Amino acid sequence: QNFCVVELLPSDPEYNTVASKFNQTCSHFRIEKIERIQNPDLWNSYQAKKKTMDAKNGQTMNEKQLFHGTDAGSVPHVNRNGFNRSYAAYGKGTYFAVNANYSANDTYSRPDANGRKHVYYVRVLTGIYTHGNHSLIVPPSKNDLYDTVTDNVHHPSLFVAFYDYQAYPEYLITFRK
Template sequence: MFTCWGREDNDTEPMETSYYSCDWFYQAVCGSWHRTEVSSHFITIPKLFPTCFHKASFPLQDDPVNPISSSEMEMLYCRDPLGSITFNTAGGNFRIDFAGYWKTNIRTGQRQKLKRSFSTDHIERCKCKDQAPSIPAYWENMDPNARFKAFKVSWQTSEYQNVERYVREIGLLQEPLRVLYRVQNVDLWELYSRKKIQLMRIKGQSDIEQRWLFHGTGKNNVENICLYNFDCRISESKRQGHVLGKGTYFALHASYADKYSRILSQGVNDTRIMFLARVIVGKYTTGRPDLCKPDGDQIENIHDSCVDNTLCPRIFVVFNSDQIYPEYVLEYGG
């Protein structure tokens, strides 16, 4: 995963620098300090079978830029406080310089500040507890005053390859993926993260089902969706036959969402556009045309979304925009 530069392991013994062990923190895009942790988030996806779908897990790391834990970083630091390490991740190739407390993207030269601090209960509480949901560490640095930015993802990264494989194998899209953009919108990400936490707390669950789902659209809608998210009210007013409810519709298969994609520009390539969104589907029920929320007029909200078929869902309807994060914009076809 990573390579140590400097002294060989047998040249020095790990040294005890203090009575307390230390942890490592990185300064996120939001300016807050977050503990360096190894964490993976799993999006539930269907695995294709002849008759139906069975659930499987597709790993989607929230922090792939930090593939080593705080304790591992501390161990390497103690071996050589002036040394450095390099590693490859979904976000690119990185180098950590212990002497200067920097993490550097080798390709772009962008740097992220690091901090080493005693791991006392007080520090943990100040740094990590009760903070806003963490922004994914693989996000690139952006202007803090920008409301959103779409970053082109290099085809050479594992991030691109994972999405491309998902689009092809799960989305069943036959046409080639031309360009992939990662949408970075701090406000929408925090709304999505808080909604996930809220639903888990209300339901008394340690997790809730999320999926990567497709939504075809036209070029004129892309900027507004990236900025404000999908608007369920607008979706409802523009839809002629909302057979599963008056919300925003997503498809399991990109090949189905392709019906609603519009050509970017008429020409030889006929490139089209589509969103790959992260969606909290939770517990779902069969939809109906009159529904404005999954459970209709019932006071208690048991369900979180509507589907076409609860056993083998292919179409999902969401009525609350906070359950959606427009994660990627796909340009494809031609």
């Protein structure tokens, strides 16, 4: 469960890609730093699920880059386990938002004692998805089951994942009001 945290410089293209995406809905916030999380075992397991999904859902673009706001205390945990079973209404899973505004909410990305906020820019294997419900602990059956559940199938603003390795916390955005 080892990992490396690499901080990106603004001068950086990778920084500008993650930043501009964040700034579509959260430009009013001040970005302090953006870090790339490198956890090799979690990345390999995520790519093993991606290779399985790609050779199953045909023409479907299984991967989406979504946002996840969390308290500063959960950061070490996500860095090593991902969006684990001991970490996790439309279901009893882990929620990922299309736009950063949902994740930039103080109830999710709880400002710490220094008033810093935490949002992950996650690689999520959304695959084939349907509408969700409150009683879901796992995704519902098709007639096998779907990969994720969403609030609105044709105009989604969030996705809920249920199994591990379905999401990779690629970047971590540390910002303040």
